[PDB]
């Protein structure tokens, strides 16, 4: 038995053309401190994480759970936008399994961490000649914190075995330490704006993703070009049947 085989071929589900407001959580002027890192569960729009080559010095680009080539094709659920400003030396210890002064007392990652971190130089932008003593971190605490936890309390650390309350002095030290950032500091000491993502493909149904592809319109041809979409072949013609606004298929 004979049969005709289709030429240009696809299937029709993708129809999107949605706006996606970004580059303000990524290119802001005011950013959070080390311990003041805030969470934005991004579920707004497509959020294309692949078009980020406008800024050249994106030295931290490695990602573990997913590859950047196959990043904006699958669907994530409840991605977290966490941003903080640290030094360039602390960028290498953001990865799980590392140790340091920031990986035990300020902010630590789980061993099963999903996502990756993006960092870039911000010394000219974030360093004044008189110093910027507004980004500060904590070094002293009673015990090591859990991952994904914030500490706000500025109580005086009781390093020694002497009773002191409020007033500092001997063996009573201030935990919060302000950074000494200068534009003349070398690589690793400059203020570096740091953004980290946590996709966390669990629990809720997936909300944030978008392919956003498009195709053409060629009426009455034995092809399948269909906005890069859901399975199904045939030919495409013009039909005069009427749908209600919430109708999709037939």
């Amino acid at each position: 038995n004979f049969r005709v085989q289709p030429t240009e071929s696809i299937v029709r589900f993708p129809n999107i053309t949605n706006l996606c407001p970004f580059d303000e959580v990524f290119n802001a002027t005011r950013f959070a401190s080390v311990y003041a890192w805030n969470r934005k569960r991004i579920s707004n729009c497509v959020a294309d994480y692949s078009v980020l080559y406008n800024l050249a010095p994106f030295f931290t680009f490695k990602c573990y759970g997913v590859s950047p080539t196959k990043l904006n094709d699958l669907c994530f659920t409840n991605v977290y936008a966490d941003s903080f400003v640290i030094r360039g030396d602390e960028v290498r210890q953001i990865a799980p399994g590392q140790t340091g002064n920031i990986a035990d007392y300020n902010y630590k990652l789980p061993d099963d961490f999903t996502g990756c971190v993006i960092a870039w130089n911000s010394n000219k932008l974030d360093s004044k000649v008189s110093g910027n003593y507004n980004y500060l971190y904590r070094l002293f605490r009673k015990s090591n914190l859990k991952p994904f936890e914030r500490d706000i309390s500025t109580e005086i650390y009781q390093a020694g075995n002497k009773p002191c309350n409020g007033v500092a002095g001997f063996n009573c030290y201030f935990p919060l330490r302000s950074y000494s950032f200068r534009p003349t500091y070398g690589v690793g000491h400059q203020p570096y704006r740091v953004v980290v993502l946590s996709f966390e493909l669990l629990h809720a149904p997936a909300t944030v993703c978008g392919p956003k592809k498009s195709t053409n319109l060629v009426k009455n041809k034995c092809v399948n070009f269909n906005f890069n979409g859901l399975k199904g072949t045939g030919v495409l013609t013009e039909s005069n049947k009427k749908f209600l606004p919430f109708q999709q298929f037939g």
Partner: antibody, heavy 118, light 109 residues
Framework: VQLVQSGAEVKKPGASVKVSCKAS????????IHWVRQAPGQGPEWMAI????????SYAQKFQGRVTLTRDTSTSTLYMELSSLRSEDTAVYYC??????????????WGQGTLVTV | SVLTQPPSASGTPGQRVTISCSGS????????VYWYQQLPGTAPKLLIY???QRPSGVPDRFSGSRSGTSASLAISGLRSEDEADYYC?????????????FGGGTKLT
């Protein structure tokens, strides 16, 4: 709209020198000042940045601690002080205006400079 | 880095002469480049802006542009007043110190 300098003479080795250059024209309190020195047989190197008012300066690695920097608005004299003067530091110091509250940018025309020798 | 420059640029009046400043990584590729002219007996002046325009006024015969990790300046119509020397300036952003490392030193005849 021009920058004038001071004078200097031969100084003893291992001492401290002080240079103040008066500035007239543009706003004194909203313009950074770059301090450089020019030596014969070599080019000029940046060595101090002046933020007027609080005098917050970010010196280089080779110019940290050895340079004392003072900025004001009433007397409008930019005080620079250098310690441990040797025969290598005999040069003409220049103070120049900058963009103002921003390091990166072009350079304003320089003054006549003050020659210091040891 | 070091920003090496040729010690001299031999030439004749009426002939175009090109001077080249050799930079390094993260100095010419991203940081803007400045060409400065040092005059004998007077204060140094802003010879040129970023490599598109003139500071206050000059004929367009003074050409300057960057390429790769280096910079170049072509000067034609040499006169007696044009007999001077030039320097190259670029932001450093180097390790342990981010001042202003200038170029080397040339000589125009």
């Amino acid at each position: 709209v021009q920058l004038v300098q001071s004078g200097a003479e031969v100084k003893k080795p291992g001492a401290s020198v002080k240079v103040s250059c008066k500035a007239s024209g543009y706003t004194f309190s909203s313009y950074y000042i770059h301090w450089v020195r020019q030596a014969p047989g070599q080019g000029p190197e940046w060595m101090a940045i002046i933020n007027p008012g609080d005098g917050g300066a970010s010196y280089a690695q080779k110019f940290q601690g050895r340079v004392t920097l003072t900025r004001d608005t009433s007397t409008s004299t930019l005080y620079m002080e250098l310690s441990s003067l040797r025969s290598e530091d005999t040069a003409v110091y220049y103070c120049a205006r900058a963009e103002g509250s921003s390091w990166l940018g072009w350079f304003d025309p320089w003054g006549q400079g003050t020659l210091v020798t040891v | 880095s070091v920003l090496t420059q040729p010690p001299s640029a031999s030439g004749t009046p009426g002939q175009r002469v090109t001077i080249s400043c050799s930079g390094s990584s993260s100095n010419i590729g991203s940081n803007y480049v400045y060409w400065y002219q040092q005059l004998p007996g007077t204060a140094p002046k802003l010879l040129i802006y970023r490599n598109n325009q003139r500071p206050s006024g000059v004929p367009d015969r003074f050409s300057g542009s960057r390429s790769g990790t280096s910079a170049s300046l072509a000067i034609s119509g040499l006169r007696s007043e044009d007999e001077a020397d030039y320097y190259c300036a670029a932001w450093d952003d180097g390790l342990s110190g981010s001042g202003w490392v200038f170029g080397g030193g040339t000589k125009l005849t």
